[PDB]
Design brief:
The structure is cut from a larger assembly and holds chains A (about 400 residues) and B (about 850 residues).
Chain A (H helix, E strand, L loop, with lengths): L3 H22 L16 H10 L4 E9 L7 E6 L3 E6 L14 E4 L6 E4 L6 H5 L17 H11 L1 H4 L2 H4 L8 E5 L6 H11 L3 E6 L10 H13 L5 E6 L17 H14 L8 E7 L17 E4 L5 H11 L11 H6 L6 H17 L7 H13 L7 H7 L1
Helix pairs in contact in A: 8-9, 10-12, 12-13
Chain B lengths: L2 H9 L2 H5 L8 H16 L7 H4 L20 H15 L6 H7 L10 H17 L9 H16 L3 H11 L14 H11 L7 H15 L3 H11 L2 H10 L3 H14 L12 H9 L3 H11 L8 H5 L7 H14 L14 H4 L6 H12 L4 H12 L4 H14 L9 H6 L8 H14 L6 H11 L6 H14 L6 H13 L12 H9 L8 H7 L6 H13 L6 H12 L10 H12 L3 H17 L2 H4 L2 H8 L6 H9 L6 H14 L6 H13 L4 H14 L6 E2 L3 E2 L4 E2 L1 H13 L6 H5 L12 E2 L2 E4 L9 E7 L12 E8 L8 E5 L4 E3 L6 E7 L6
Parallel strand pairs in B: 5-10
Antiparallel strand pairs in B: 1-4, 2-3, 6-7, 6-8, 9-10
Helix pairs in contact in B: 3-5, 5-6, 7-9, 8-9, 10-11, 11-12, 12-13, 12-14, 14-15, 18-20, 18-39, 20-21, 20-22, 21-22, 22-24, 24-26, 25-26, 26-28, 26-40, 27-28, 28-30, 30-32, 31-32, 32-33, 32-35, 33-35, 35-37, 35-40, 36-37, 37-39, 38-39
Classes of the chains: A alpha/beta (about 400), B mainly alpha (about 850).
The structure holds adenosine-5'-triphosphate and magnesium ion.
Adenosine-5'-triphosphate binds next to helix 7, helix 10 and helix 12 of chain A.
InterPro entries (chain A): 26S_Proteasome_ATPase, AAA+_ATPase, AAA_lid_3, ATPase_AAA_core, ATPase_AAA_CS, NA-bd_OB-fold, P-loop_NTPase, PRS7-like_OB
Keywords (chain A): Acetylation, ATP-binding, Cytoplasm, Nucleotide-binding, Phosphoprotein, Proteasome, Ubl conjugation
Main location (chain A): cytoplasm
């Protein structure tokens, strides 16, 4: 307390200093999206505002007299107008093709720069940019499943040399199916963490849209954007939202959604080659999927995430009880035997609830009795709401 | 008005009336009750007697009682009431006075809040008291002999250390330290040594050392001695211990710091003790983890470049560094450990110099097996390969001390070779092999090279870098004498050459971290001409205060940074920016102030001023990939100034050196695509990828270990050698002297946590690894790790994560769970 008076004097002087420092340094405000003044190259911006002129985005439609020395280009300037223009002197004639987006000026509308194809911002955000914090070491009881998943979606990209030499075309699709909590998305999250190619996450509910032809359109732009990369991965979590089997119920039952599935089926295996995309589908209801989608060439590998066995459940218990402050003699083999048909999600809850019984008792170490009570609360007491009994019939 | 409050308000008159009577019969019962009256409200911390606050003017009636007659009992309790009243107001020379003159009973009897006020005033008047007032501190020392025991009794121990610190009497703290609170005082005091200035730096360090020595906590006592750089104390600390198991673990810390101790044969277990500190078993221990962590497989630079996901002599030289950096200290590689002649000859000009030297970096710390592979390239007729191998000699012994040195034998007869390249691989290699040794035989063999007439400026600077690295932080006057002697003999024109910049660095390294030992050297530097004298004195002055945090020293460096020149005159400006990093790096608080200043230098500074900011970022946070710096370095990666562009990209890899950051590698891969058409920029990009994946994520370049409190002089020497050389990245790094990047080998150490048994065999147990938490202040048991995970011991700890044993089955010898640690079975466990 003898320094309480001296603390506030230097604290207030400090707070006055930051307020003083920010006065000369600047960076106050940001509501208009202003960068800190240390990054202001105002000399270049003034030149940029003059030397670099703005360019209107237009789409080339038809090239007239491409063979001759006077090739005229018809452009569609979005909602503005249509113009027959010629190329600029700084762009090669072979760099502009019909149907591609171009940048045109506001005076003579001459094409100045070819542009990337238009892609829905929603589809762009569907690509993964921060890899998840899940590795293959966090998945227990899925050894054989994981090798099959890696050798299709991870190995060919990592070491492509061992497939071209033998004339091998690796499978370009994997379907992960199993009851909820079995680890379908967990293994996919492990794939994204390890993969170095582009990973796109698609949820089947994201492909359901208000207007007619959107879900097919978003699939088209999804694969169009995936094809602009040397290697790509598309994850379709809960494909059964749009992957349901086609049917005719008199009325237009699920006609629009079926078209979205048909477009996805067309991109996977149609007239045109798909590219270097390896798709990954996860669903807890594989019985509802369309037969054409469940066909090799679209879903070549069908990896089943069945309920873990005794060895697998013991492995999952160790994974989730790795960081627990457990006792010395916790019989995890016994715990795995007390939940015969239990998902890995239940085992995680058992581990979490086991520490909850100890935290409730103000104990810093969870005994084996807490895990025994956790199994009764999770595996037994919560067995009324278990999704396993109904979903094993679907898988 | 409460009646009980009015009852005390009555005592302002009737009790004073009892003290107003001439007879002393009524004095004692009133004063004794008055003395106890204060304790009535003292029992509650918040409750204070407000009627007593109205008795302050009443002291005039009591003025004669406590002053004008005998001090037996009349003044005794009369003054103490004023002392409690002196707590309320300013109390300048009053609150202490009545307690000093009045009753001298147990101090805590008047309250914890009263003594806390009293203790603070003790230090206040102590500064006021002069030398002639030594006859006034007799009762002052008595209180501190009782205040300190009271503070530690009620866990208010951090307040106690504060009392002795202000009065400069921290000497008497150790006598009263108890078993239950030794850890709190030392941890508190050691945290204070990074902010108190000289001479109280050592004094607080020695006093904290005394507590550890008395309490038989030798391993932590040795850490304090190493921070003090007291070689005699290190001898005394080591030999005093009779527990050889503690001594074996202690020898690891000396080896990790690179400090060698010459033991006597009479000391028991002499053999293993020298082996442990010499790091001869480091190669096998490091290889043991590699087999355990199933990452022994070699990595080609293609696996790092990952060009199949992307939508020349310099290219070949870049991949030589990437191959060496990624497979550093491993002994196996698919590109050079195989038949590398096709790859080795793919490089050209000096590209083969670093490529041949890169071969020894895969064999780092493997002196026996590594020298078995270089011999093939040692007989090459092409001049670059042999001297590149000659430098690869120094790498293979770097960080290891051999009882008889192989490297000197392979390099002694090539320091005076007629061809300059052959020397170039000799002195630079010889420097890395014995960096931080201060050994006279090599220095005497290395010294005349600098003064050689045929010795070009390139090798002369290399000689300064080497001899500076051998005698780093030793203030060896012999190396000092020649470095000055070469400097002023040189002509003014050749001082324009940037290879002369290495001469002050060698001088600076020789006085690394000494501080006040440069004024005699700075005196000699005034004779040297400008602008090199401006460059020379700045370099040595910065190196003198390296890892000190002296705010006074960094005050002058920004004064150099304030005056901007409209290049040739501002050559010394780069070191000044690099100076802030070298001084503030000591502790975290000083370090991240530097980032804020580093932002303004990148903003208001001149090109030459801002060309050194990225290197300062690399120095301030080497192998610590924080997002603020990485985002900062990313923004200036594509800078208009080419040097800032190269320097930022190198710093980005340097900041995440050996961290294997997945996010950072993506930025470099993106940077590779952007700078694909720029050969100069792309070379730094490839260099950063190799450093990012240095040792496949198992090597660090950070100079600080032992919970980031103990500084390795060897590591900074390699750190300084590369970064100072990067002030001229165009001519040195991008030119013909890119071998200087091998100075980073002197700083290459494993991010290690290996638990050994008492017989030194591996002992894998469950450990908790998580971000370090400051636990100064808060009493009880605070957690030192947050967001932790449980792993087996053979795990890699990046910057800023501590390690705690998950169970209590084993008792660690050192509280610091870093490097090689010996575990002892807990007798309490399995009771
Ligand atoms: N094999 C496993 N090993 C370890 N943990 C597992 C395993 N399977 C599931 N879990 C845990 O259970 C959680 C269940 O989520 P997860 O994404 O794996 O479910 P899912 O199989 O995709 O289910 P749903 O069909 O409902 O989508 C995971 O987040 C993980 O923590
Ligand atoms: Mg799922």
């Amino acid at each position: 307390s003898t320094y309480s008076r001296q603390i506030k004097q230097v604290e207030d002087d400090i707070q006055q200093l930051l307020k003083k420092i920010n006065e000369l340094t600047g960076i106050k405000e940001s509501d208009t999206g202003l960068a800190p003044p240390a990054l202001w190259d105002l000399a270049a911006d003034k030149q940029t505002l003059q030397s670099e002129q703005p360019l209107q985005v237009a789409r080339c439609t038809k090239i007239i007299n491409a063979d001759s020395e006077d090739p005229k280009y018809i452009i569609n300037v979005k909602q503005f107008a249509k113009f027959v223009v010629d190329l600029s002197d700084q762009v090669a004639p072979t760099d502009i093709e019909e149907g591609m987006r171009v940048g045109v000026d506001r005076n003579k509308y001459q094409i100045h720069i070819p542009l990337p194809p238009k892609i829905d911002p929603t589809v762009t955000m569907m690509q993964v940019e921060e890899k998840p914090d899940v590795t293959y070491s966090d998945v227990g009881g899925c050894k054989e499943q994981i090798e099959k998943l890696r050798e299709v979606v991870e190995t060919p990209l990592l070491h492509p040399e061992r497939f071209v030499n033998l004339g091998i075309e690796p499978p370009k699709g994997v379907l992960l199916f199993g009851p909820p909590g079995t680890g379908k998305t967990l293994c996919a999250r492990a794939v994204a963490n390890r993969t170095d190619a582009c990973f796109i996450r698609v949820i089947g509910s994201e492909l359901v849209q208000k207007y007619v032809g959107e879900g097919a359109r978003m699939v088209r732009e999804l694969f169009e954007m995936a094809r602009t990369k040397k290697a790509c991965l598309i994850f379709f979590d809960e494909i059964d939202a749009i992957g349901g089997a086609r049917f005719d119920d008199g009325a237009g039952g699920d006609n629009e959604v079926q078209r979205t599935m048909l477009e996805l089926i067309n991109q996977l295996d149609g007239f045109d080659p798909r590219g270097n995309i390896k798709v990954l589908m996860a669903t807890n209801r594989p019985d509802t999927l369309d037969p054409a989608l469940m066909r090799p060439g679209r879903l070549d590998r069908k990896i089943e995430f069945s309920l873990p066995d005794l060895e697998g459940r013991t492995h999952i218990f160790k994974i989730h009880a790795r960081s627990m402050s457990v006792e010395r003699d916790i019989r995890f083999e016994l715990l795995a035997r007390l939940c015969p048909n239990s998902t890995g999600a239940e085992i995680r809850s058992v581990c979490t609830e086991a520490g909850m019984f100890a935290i409730r008792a103000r104990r810093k170490i969870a005994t084996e009795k807490d895990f025994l009570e956790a199994v009764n609360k999770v595996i037994k007491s919560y067995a009324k709401f278990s999704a396993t009994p109904r979903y094993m019939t679907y898988n | 008005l409460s009646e009980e409050d009015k009852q005390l308000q009555d005592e302002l008159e009737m009790l004073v009336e009892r003290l107003g009577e001439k007879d002393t019969s009524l004095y004692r019962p009133a004063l004794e009750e008055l003395r106890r009256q204060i304790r009535s409200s003292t029992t509650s911390m918040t409750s204070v007697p407000k009627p007593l606050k109205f008795l302050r003017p009443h002291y005039g009636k009591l003025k004669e009682i406590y002053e004008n007659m005998a001090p037996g009992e009349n003044k005794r309790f009369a003054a103490d009431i004023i002392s409690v009243l002196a707590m309320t107001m300013s109390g300048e020379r009053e609150c202490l006075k009545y307690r000093l003159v009045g009753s001298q009973e147990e101090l805590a009897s008047w309250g914890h809040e009263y003594v806390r006020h009293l203790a603070g005033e003790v230090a206040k008047e102590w500064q006021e008291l002069d030398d002639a007032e030594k006859v006034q501190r007799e009762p002052l020392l008595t209180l501190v002999k009782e205040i300190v025991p009271y503070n530690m009794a009620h866990n208010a121990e951090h307040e106690a250390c504060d009392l002795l610190m202000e009065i400069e009497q921290v000497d008497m703290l150790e006598k009263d330290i108890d078993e239950n609170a030794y850890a709190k005082v030392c941890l508190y005091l050691t945290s204070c040594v990074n902010y108190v200035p000289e001479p109280e730096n050592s004094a607080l360090l020695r006093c904290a050392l005394g507590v550890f020595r008395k309490f038989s906590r030798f391993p932590e006592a040795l850490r304090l001695a190493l921070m003090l750089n007291d070689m005699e104390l290190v001898e005394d600390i080591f030999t005093s211990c009779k527990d050889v198991v503690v001594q074996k673990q202690m020898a690891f810390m000396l080896g990790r710091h690179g400090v060698f101790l010459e033991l006597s044969e009479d000391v028991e277990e002499y053999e293993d003790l020298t082996e442990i500190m010499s790091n001869v078993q480091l190669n096998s221990n490091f290889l043991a983890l590699a087999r355990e962590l199933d990452i022994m497989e070699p990595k080609v630079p293609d696996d790092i470049y990952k060009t199949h996901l992307e939508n020349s002599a310099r290219m070949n030289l870049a991949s030589s560094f990437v191959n060496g950096f990624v497979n550093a200290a491993f002994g196996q590689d698919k590109l050079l450990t195989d038949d590398g002649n096709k790859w080795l000859y793919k490089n050209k000009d000096h590209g083969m110099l670093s490529a041949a030297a890169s071969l020894g970096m895969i064999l780092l710390w493997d002196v026996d097996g590594g020298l078995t592979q270089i011999d093939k390239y040692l007989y090459s007729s092409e001049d670059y390969i042999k001297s590149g191998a000659l430098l690869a000699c120094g790498i293979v012994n770097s960080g290891v001390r051999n009882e008889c040195d192989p490297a000197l034998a392979l390099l002694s007869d090539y320091v005076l070779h007629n061809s300059n390249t052959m020397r170039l691989g000799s002195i630079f290699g010889l420097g890395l092999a014995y960096a931080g040794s201060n050994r006279e035989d090599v220095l005497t063999l290395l010294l005349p090279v600098m003064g050689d007439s045929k010795s070009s400026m390139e090798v002369a600077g290399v000689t300064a870098l080497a001899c500076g690295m051998i005698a780093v932080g030793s203030c060896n006057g012999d190396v000092t004498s020649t470095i000055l002697q070469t400097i002023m003999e040189k002509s003014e024109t050749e001082l324009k050459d940037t290879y002369a910049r290495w001469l002050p660095l060698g001088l600076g390294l020789n006085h690394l971290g000494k501080g006040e030992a440069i004024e005699a050297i700075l005196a000699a530097l005034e004779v040297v001409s400008e602008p090199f004298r401006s460059f020379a004195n700045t370099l040595v002055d910065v190196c003198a205060y390296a890892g000190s945090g002296n705010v006074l020293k960094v005050q002058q460096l920004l004064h150099i940074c304030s005056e901007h020149f409209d290049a040739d005159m501002g050559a010394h400006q780069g070191v000044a920016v690099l100076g802030i990093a070298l001084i503030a790096m000591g502790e975290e608080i000083g370090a991240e102030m530097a980032l804020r200043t580093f932002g303004h230098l990148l903003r208001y500074g001149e090109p030459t001023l801002r060309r050194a900011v990225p290197l300062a970022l690399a120095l301030i946070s080497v192998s610590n990939p924080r997002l603020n710096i990485l985002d900062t370095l990313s923004k200036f990666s594509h800078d208009a100034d080419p040097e800032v562009s190269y320097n930022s990209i190198f710093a980005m890899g340097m900041v995440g050196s050996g961290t294997n950051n997945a996010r950072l590698a993506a930025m470099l891969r993106q940077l590779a695509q952007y700078h694909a058409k720029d050969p100069n920029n792309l070379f730094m990009v490839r260099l950063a990828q190799g450093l990012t994946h240095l040792g496949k994520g198992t090597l660090t370049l950070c100079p600080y270990h032992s919970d980031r409190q103990l500084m390795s002089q060897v590591a900074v020497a390699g750190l300084l050698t590369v970064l100072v050389s990067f002030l001229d990245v165009r001519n040195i790094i991008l030119g013909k002297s890119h071998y200087v990047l091998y100075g980073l080998v002197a700083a290459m150490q494993p991010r290690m946590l290996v638990t050994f048994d008492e017989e030194l065999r591996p002992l894998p147990v469950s450990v908790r690894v998580g971000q370090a938490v400051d636990v100064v202040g808060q009493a009880g048991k605070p957690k030192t790790i947050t967001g932790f995970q449980t792993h087996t011991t053979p795990v890699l700890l990046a910057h800023g994560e501590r390690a705690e044993l998950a169970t209590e089955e084993f008792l660690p010898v050192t509280p610091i769970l870093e490097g090689f640690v010996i575990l002892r079975k807990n007798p309490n466990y399995d009771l």
